[PDB]
Symmetry: C3
Subunit: 132 residues, 3 copies
């Protein structure tokens, strides 16, 4: 399913979280874009999406987004990244998915821990994409 490079920074004193969708590579040619959903517990509270890159298994997005965090910490916040193939005339297929959050299974888990442990530091990591 490929890999996705993302950078996040938690502005702890101002309750914002900045998320940069940097690049994807080794995607399963597709016309990728990335959708970013922000959840508070299980409720989606915000969504963003990048521009689409045409016909390529590797795509530089470089898109920074700013999220408002409606609570005093990231404990119940999670971020969902969806790499989708833009296709006219049909529903866009999910190429891969990545979740970061306090209970996220590994990759996503450690990156989120670091984000919470180091507020105000932008941290970037490559993650393997899962089925979505």
């Amino acid at each position: 399913r490929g890999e996705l490079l993302v950078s996040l920074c938690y502005q702890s004193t101002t309750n914002t979280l900045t998320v940069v969708v940097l690049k994807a590579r080794h995607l399963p040619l597709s016309d990728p874009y990335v959708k970013v959903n922000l959840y508070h517990a299980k409720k989606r509270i915000s969504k963003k999406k990048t521009h689409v890159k045409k016909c390529t298994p590797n795509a530089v997005f470089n898109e920074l987004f700013v999220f408002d965090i409606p609570c005093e910490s990231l404990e119940e916040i999670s971020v969902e990244f969806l790499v989708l193939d833009s296709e006219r005339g049909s529903r866009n297929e999910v190429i891969g998915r990545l979740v970061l959050g306090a209970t996220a299974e590994g990759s996503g888990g450690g990156h989120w821990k670091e984000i919470c442990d180091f507020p105000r530091r932008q941290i970037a990591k490559w993650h393997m994409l899962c089925d979505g």
Copy 2:
């Protein structure tokens, strides 16, 4: 007048200020670029400009600039951002303006305070543009 997303980082021990013009959105189609002027008190001491994005109310610029700061603090330094419409054959019109500095009125004010309070941290914020 739209909005402009910018990130700044004050390298206090080396007297440089890095300014990233990230994106504009909801611009009043125009062919936007952004000009960045740096002032020490009321004297312009440096200027930069981005490339132009063609025919669009939303534009990803992603342009980082490095400014030399000729004094030991940011107390008398201010940064002026101008979103302009590139038009051949006439003076380019100012679509909107944003000022950050110690006496700047609100948005620009708080972002600058944070920049001075947190040297070496890159901080990004959306700002409403004013008439210019």
Copy 3:
């Protein structure tokens, strides 16, 4: 030989180094790209390259790379940047070179010192390119 703007951040607790190739200017028109080699002592342990920008003495690359550092510090690590002209049908010529490392001669030297002195801070600097 022109100049190259690069930003680096040493994630000291996780042994990764993030390197952003931002822009080149005043290049000697060429079709520039940048190759980035990582050395541990004198052995190349990783390599990356940007996309190429066509026919221009100034080029925005904005490419972030993540390097694994196989040791506990940056003492014996160095990073080599090569600005090359992409040319079909012949070996691509090196337009300029830049080295950052503990024993690097000046520019590269001070930027690397700052990188080691300020782990987790992304630091950006313009450097003059040398013959390569």
